[PDB]
Design a binder for these strands. Sequence first.
RNA 1: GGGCAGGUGCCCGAGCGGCCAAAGGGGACGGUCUGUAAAACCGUUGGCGUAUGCCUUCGCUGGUUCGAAUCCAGCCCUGCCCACCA
RNA 2: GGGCAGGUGCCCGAGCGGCCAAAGGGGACGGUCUGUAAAACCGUUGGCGUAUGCCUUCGCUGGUUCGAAUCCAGCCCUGCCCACCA
Lengths: 425, 425
Amino acid sequence: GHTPEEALALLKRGAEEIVPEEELLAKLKEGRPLTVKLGADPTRPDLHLGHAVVLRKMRQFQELGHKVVLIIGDFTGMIGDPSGRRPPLTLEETRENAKTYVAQAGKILRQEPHLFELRYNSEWLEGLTFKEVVRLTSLMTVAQMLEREDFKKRYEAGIPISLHELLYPFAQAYDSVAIRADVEMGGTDQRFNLLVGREVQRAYGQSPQVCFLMPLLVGLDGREKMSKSLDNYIGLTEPPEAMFKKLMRVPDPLLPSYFRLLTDLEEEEIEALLKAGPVPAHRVLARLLTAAYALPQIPPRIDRAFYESLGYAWEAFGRDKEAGPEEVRRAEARYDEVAKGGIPEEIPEVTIPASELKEGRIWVARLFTLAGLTPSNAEARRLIQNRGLRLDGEVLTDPMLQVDLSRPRILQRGKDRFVRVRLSD
Amino acid sequence: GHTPEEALALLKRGAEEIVPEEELLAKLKEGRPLTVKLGADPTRPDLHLGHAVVLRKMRQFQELGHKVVLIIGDFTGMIGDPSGRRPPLTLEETRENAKTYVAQAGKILRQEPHLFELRYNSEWLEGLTFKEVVRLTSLMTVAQMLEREDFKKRYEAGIPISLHELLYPFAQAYDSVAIRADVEMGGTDQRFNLLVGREVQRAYGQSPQVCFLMPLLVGLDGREKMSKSLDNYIGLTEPPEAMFKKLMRVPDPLLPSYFRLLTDLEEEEIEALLKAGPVPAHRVLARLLTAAYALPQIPPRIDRAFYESLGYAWEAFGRDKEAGPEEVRRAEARYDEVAKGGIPEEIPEVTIPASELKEGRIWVARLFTLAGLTPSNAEARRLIQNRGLRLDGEVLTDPMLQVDLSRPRILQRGKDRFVRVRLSD
RNA sequence: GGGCAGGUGCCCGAGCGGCCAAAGGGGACGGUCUGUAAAACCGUUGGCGUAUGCCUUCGCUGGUUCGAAUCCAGCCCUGCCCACCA
RNA sequence: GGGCAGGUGCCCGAGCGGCCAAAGGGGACGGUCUGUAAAACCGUUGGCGUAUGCCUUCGCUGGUUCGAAUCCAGCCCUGCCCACCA
Ligand SMILES: [Mg+2]
Ligand SMILES: [Mg+2]
Ligand SMILES: [Mg+2]
Ligand SMILES: [Mg+2]
């Protein structure tokens, strides 16, 4: 139901760069399903909303009739860094992690075969001969390859670059040859390797792939890209209660990009939400995405129609807190209840064996560590000095307190981490 | 008949560097035939006295009971430079060139199997998998590999380095792993790649090879290394007449190195020859080597005993021109006859068809080109202006001369190139 | 994927419309003197049988011009510089 | 194959025998004020149930010393610099 020009315009929204854009228009006019490549690193199988930026653009390709080929990078996943300057995965860890990745990616991507194929690049890379590897690497010079920013910066700074790292752009580029990619997806940070793909496809007599680059989502800290290692992320499989709370804590300046990169709202609708204020805009964002990722798969369009289909009223601009799917309504209620200093209805339970007692009690610092709220008794003590711990809703001021557990106690660390502890022989 | 220490001392003579030298002593004390590697590039199968420096050291290893493994580099010979920034050999040109190389190398190397094996590195390189190649290249960093002088100089100068060129040191190093090399031979200009061999052998759990580096022989120009492309070389298969003349024209300052790198004369004997004067020293050098390379194989020791076995007297210091093998005596006589302005007894004949005539004659410039002495009539004319051409022993002063060929004529270009021309329908 | 600059004779490299088979350095080649060496000095370093000429010639293919190695356009390869940078 | 220098806390990085769980910048974490936001301000940023203490702590393994993150030795990895350069 879209002309090629309409399809290009839909696809352009949110993108940092489509290159060459005119080539994508030509491919869209061929009236055939385009092969849309995404390489996935099996060593990092847990997806977050940052990964969803590219994956939802791929879903849009699929809704337009194009075919995702998801390439698990098990070849390099099983080699890793053989020098040491992440460890290598076993064949079992590789299929396990691939399974996790595909399961989470399927919360976004269509899975019908005509729209989706899973491949493992070991299928074709394991057999690539030395001679073919030499001829592949001859396609670029040393100076050309050192232009990539992490090579240039490390080299000029005296930080080691393993020479095998110069082979990996060619493996990724060969993956494009192996599947005859029409488009390769990536974040902006993959631009160089995607361009190498074009060069390698030309050398193999193929049409060079369009490189389709999405911006990187910034994390909850407000400065750095969302990433697992920076602990600033929102995972696609986090419980609705936690996803909703994290989305309410997205720094205000990031709201436009979250709406543009994670929903399909029109720019006029986004502006209308921001005019209602930052907290209203947050509630709408959190409801949309918490709902979408609570489903087994996000809808084809996370848009105003989807919002109203959940039971919310657009013209209420966040005030209609009692509507929505039960999972979302409850999550939002918990957020507000915790905000005004209340204790939520359901909190995690940790049963503590009687063997942990000492003179019939448990030192409060060690109790928090046993409950999993603190990593050490020393840290529990420091948090008490900083008024960061509560017991039964009272701020702890005595770091020597010995806690009576003859009835369950409610422990709290910071703003919203609660554990109810009770004794059990 | 040599202790390990005696063997090391023999081997050290002429060498620029044995590294680690103490490791070679340890290997010699094992009392077993050591595997002595030489890689040979099949694209350059014609050998000259420069190649003889390394090859004669290998012969000395063989005379001490050690085993040469001669590795034809047909893998890289058949790939070449796939970018273009020498062309690739066909499988037929590769075996043909290998045949030429081995034939000439056998003028120096023993050929018994226990002392000599021929291998082609395609035997093991063609099958090296991509995974193994990645792990090989991980053994060095970019900065380490760019230390090699031609990489550092080209990179700093903005001269292209094809990235596949960074793979070739690993292929050469893997060849050492494949044959379990104890020693790898090379000129000083191969020091870096030989050291990479050590590093790769260690990674494969092998004893790292001793790197055995010979200096490079300087050519007849007196400055540059002897090499085919600089036209300053003496080929191992040149006719005795020409080898003898070229050896008489070795610049005086190179005499010590030619004696050290190409003969086994003692330093005392070499000094005694130089004391007799440069021309006497030249005659002895030219007789020794012309004789040695006129044989189907050089003797185990090109030394004073070998000299006297040819019929010459050491104490004559070159004056005994009438002695020696017929081939040498005749070559030396030709040299002296040409020197004093005579025409040699036997000169090449070129028969010229009558169709080349013009008004019953041939313009002298075109005659020299037809005889193969000049590459163009223009050059023949320039040489006449420079008094570089003779006809029947007279210096040509008329560049318009039309030559009568009703009897054979003797043409001369420069000092010692002669062609007798005669007509033939 | 974007920009700029470069590719010239045996090599490096200059060339800013004619003075260009082309500066300068190097190399090689011929000769003198000899030792078939070096040095020093002089010469040579696209081709063509009638020359006041013809052919070809500066990465490739075209173009403006009486005339292009030079200026213009498209292309090839390279270098630097962008892009990428969390 | 040879030389020198480097590797420190969440990160960068200082440390020149004790003043070192360790400068400075950054990050993160707790709290106030709130909007479970930012800002600003104050605090925190090896472990240990009795603490004036104990354990562990600056690439690895040892050593000098009352005492080593610091000095010494051997080793690992890296960077620069050699070697290689025709
Ligand atoms: Mg570019
Ligand atoms: Mg470009
Ligand atoms: Mg080194
Ligand atoms: Mg070293």
